[PDB]
């Protein structure tokens, strides 16, 4: 059925593994070094004067597929506010996420907030904590601090009756080598599964598509499997 919450509010938390980390850049690719046994990725997504998501994520390879399952937990929103009310614009501003190394659980950490356009004008901030910590014993790529520019166009599949959301992502690393980037050169199939909760509203996404890092581009349709 309908989600419960608005679709661009759960982009973020629907593979970074597939950015586009240019030459000079690819020893600060943490996200592909951790493959294919991958990483968890949590995060808490504080939406200002509401709500925040909880997120926590494996990602991994599972066969030739790269999978994303997701468990999401939603508290303290406003029946009435920006998100469960639906106020929010179907699209997706770019974003800098910034990424630091944490030595001390062998992974990475993430910040970043996200704009989300309300349809009277006003913005709807998302602010995004993020860290991961790869699954594997193996060695992995800590990076010096940079971040991820992202682009990302949203539509509508026509011939499509349930609620569903159609994503174009391109993403490339800046502002500054492993086994686990082979598993990268070409494209690769994806999932992606989410079972959610906010306010007791509970919903499950799943998405299908492709990711090709080599331009660091993406392409899924997200269904909801309610």
């Known amino acids: ?19 586009r980390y240019p030459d000079h ?7 592909k070094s951790a493959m294919p046994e991958g990483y968890v990725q949590e995060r808490t997504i504080s939406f200002k004067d509401d709500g925040k998501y ?32 639906h106020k929010l614009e179907y699209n997706f501003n770019s974003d800098n996420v910034y990424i630091t190394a944490d030595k001390q659980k062998n992974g990475i950490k993430a910040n970043f907030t996200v704009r989300h356009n309300v349809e009277d004008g006003s913005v709807q901030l998302a602010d995004h904590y993020q860290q991961n910590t790869p699954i594997g014993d193996g060695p992995v790529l800590l990076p010096d601090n940079h971040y991820l520019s992202t682009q990302t166009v949203l539509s509508k599949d ?6 569903h959301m159609v994503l174009l992502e391109f993403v490339t690393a800046a502002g ?51």
């Open 158 to 163: 026509p011939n499509e009756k349930r609620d």
């Open 54 to 85: 909880k997120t926590r994520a494996v990602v991994k390879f599972e066969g030739d597929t790269l999978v994303n399952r997701i468990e999401l937990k939603g508290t303290d929103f406003k029946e009435d506010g920006n998100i469960l009310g």
């Open 176 to 226: 500054i080598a492993s086994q686990g980037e082979e598993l990268f050169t070409g494209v690769v199939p994806i999932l992606v599964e989410l079972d959610g909760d906010v306010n007791g509203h509970k919903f499950s996404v799943r998405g299908e598509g492709e990711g090709d890092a080599t331009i660091g581009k993406l392409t899924l349709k997200f269904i909801s499997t309610t």
């Open 25 to 31: 850049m690819k020893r600060h690719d943490f996200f």
């Open 1 to 19: 059925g309908k989600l419960p919450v608005p679709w661009p509010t759960l982009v973020t938390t629907l593979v970074q593994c597939f950015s």
